[PDB]
Amino acid sequence: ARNPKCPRIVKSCHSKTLDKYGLIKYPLTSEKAMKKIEEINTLVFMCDKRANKKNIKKSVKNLFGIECDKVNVLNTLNGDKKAYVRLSGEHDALEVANKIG
RNA sequence: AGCACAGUCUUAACGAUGGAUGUCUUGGUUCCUACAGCGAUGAAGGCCGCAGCAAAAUGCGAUACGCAAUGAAAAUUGCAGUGACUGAAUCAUCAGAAUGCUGAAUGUAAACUACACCAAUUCCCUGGGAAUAGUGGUACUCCUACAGAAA
Numbered sequence: 001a002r003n004p005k006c007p008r009i010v011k012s013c014h015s016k017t018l019d020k021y022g023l024i025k026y027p028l029t030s031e032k033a034m035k036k037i038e039e040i041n042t043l044v045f046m047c048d049k050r051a052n053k054k055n056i057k058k059s060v061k062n063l064f065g066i067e068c069d070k071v072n073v074l075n076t077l078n079g080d081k082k083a084y085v086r087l088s089g090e091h092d093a094l095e096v097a098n099k100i101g
Numbered sequence: 102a103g104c105a106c107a108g109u110c111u112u113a114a115c116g117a118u119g120g121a122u123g124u125c126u127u128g129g130u131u132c133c134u135a136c137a138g139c140g141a142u143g144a145a146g147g148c149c150g151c152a153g154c155a156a157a158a159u160g161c162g163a164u165a166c167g168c169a170a171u172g173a174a175a176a177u178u179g180c181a182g183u184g185a186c187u188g189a190a191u192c193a194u195c196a197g198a199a200u201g202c203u204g205a206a207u208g209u210a211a212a213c214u215a216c217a218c219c220a221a222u223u224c225c226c227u228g229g230g231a232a233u234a235g236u237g238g239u240a241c242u243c244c245u246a247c248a249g250a251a252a
């Protein structure tokens with residue numbers, strides 16, 4: 001069991017680890033994403049390469065009035081994660097789209 | 102409106118082709134002088150990023166072609182925008198802050214963003230109130246000290 005008289009390294013700086021702002025970067029337009037928004041209430045977000053599904057969900061919860069049933073993700077060949085977020089039935093992605101912009 | 106045979110060869114003039122010559126020169130080279138190490142406080146090297154419109158190089162590191170601070174000091178400009186009337190636009194300086202993933206690489210791994218285990222960790226306010234699966238730590242060898250067990 002450790003009992004160091006002082007800790008070795010103490011990062012006093014504000015955390016570098018990615019917050020909501022930084023994790024999730026921006027929604028996608030593109031005809032595909034628009035279609036998704038219209039038809040099956042799935043919002044498409046470009047996110048950081050090092051976002052997990054859990055993390056993305058958390059971000060979405062924090063950044064917007066969104067509850068997400070399921071999140072699929074993929075790594076784009078442009079070095080971004082694209083997260084397809086299916087909203088719970090209580091919410092209309094269209095309305096939330098409008099709210100965001 | 103006419104007249105040259107055509108080809109081959111030659112000469113001259115005027116052009117094409119090419120990049121010689123000459124002229125340059127933010128480069129090299131040599132010599133001289135001067136200092137002289139970086140790294141578990143994570144080096145060099147490598148990746149991945151980072152610009153409003155951004156490929157390379159250049160610079161930088163999730164504060165990402167820069168932050169603070171200092172010394173200049175009114176511009177910057179391709180457009181957009183940002184500034185002056187001096188901690189501000191731009192330079193230099195650079196001591197503060199920060200410094201992604203790696204790499205000796207060091208928790209086990211490695212064509213894995215695979216996997217353990219131990220601390221949960223972090224921030225705010227003057228003992229509470231908030232967050233986030235996030236953050237640290239754990240290599241081998243060695244030294245001094247301590248520990249309680251072994252002969």
Ligand SMILES: [Mg+2]
Nearest residue numbers: 072073074075
């Ligand atoms: Mg998948």
Ligand SMILES: [Mg+2]
Nearest residue numbers: 105106107108
């Ligand atoms: Mg003839």
Ligand SMILES: [Mg+2]
Nearest residue numbers: 137138139140
């Ligand atoms: Mg030496």
Ligand SMILES: [Mg+2]
Nearest residue numbers: 168169170188
């Ligand atoms: Mg400054």
Ligand SMILES: [Mg+2]
Nearest residue numbers: 171172174188
């Ligand atoms: Mg000044």
Ligand SMILES: [Mg+2]
Nearest residue numbers: 206207208210
């Ligand atoms: Mg390792």
Ligand SMILES: [Mg+2]
Nearest residue numbers: 211212213215
């Ligand atoms: Mg394998």
